[PDB]
Amino acid sequence: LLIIFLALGVLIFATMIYYAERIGAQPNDPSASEHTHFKNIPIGFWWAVVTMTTLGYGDMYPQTWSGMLVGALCALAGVLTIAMPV
């Protein structure tokens, strides 16, 4: 149950943060994402694990208001979905 909850949360929040961080993307740069650590989704998996476990290394964090909302939701949902079966 715990591994299923973690996998679902990680996938959903990784996709959400990757799409949120691209709203504030600068149009000038040719690449889709240049100023954000969330250049793709697997990086989102790593960040989602680190953020749901309330670890918070700080190597990668959202830098956009939408990203900040997604990050707050990720932290809260991680606390809940970890405190369910433990």
Added chain:
Amino acid sequence: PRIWALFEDPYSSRYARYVAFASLFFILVSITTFCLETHERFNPIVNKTYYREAETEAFLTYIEGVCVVWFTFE
């Protein structure tokens, strides 16, 4: 009943469990194709003649077509 047995519980039959495993495989393939489509390694920059952008690899589009064919059949 035999038609609807494809949407019933997997353990309720053998065809049901087999279609369940197949749909699981195809959903996982779709999710993986999405996650790899969002990557840089599969989005190399190209020159189009006058717009400059990055294009997705053809393999991902073909796999997506296969998965969408399966899902539309189901």
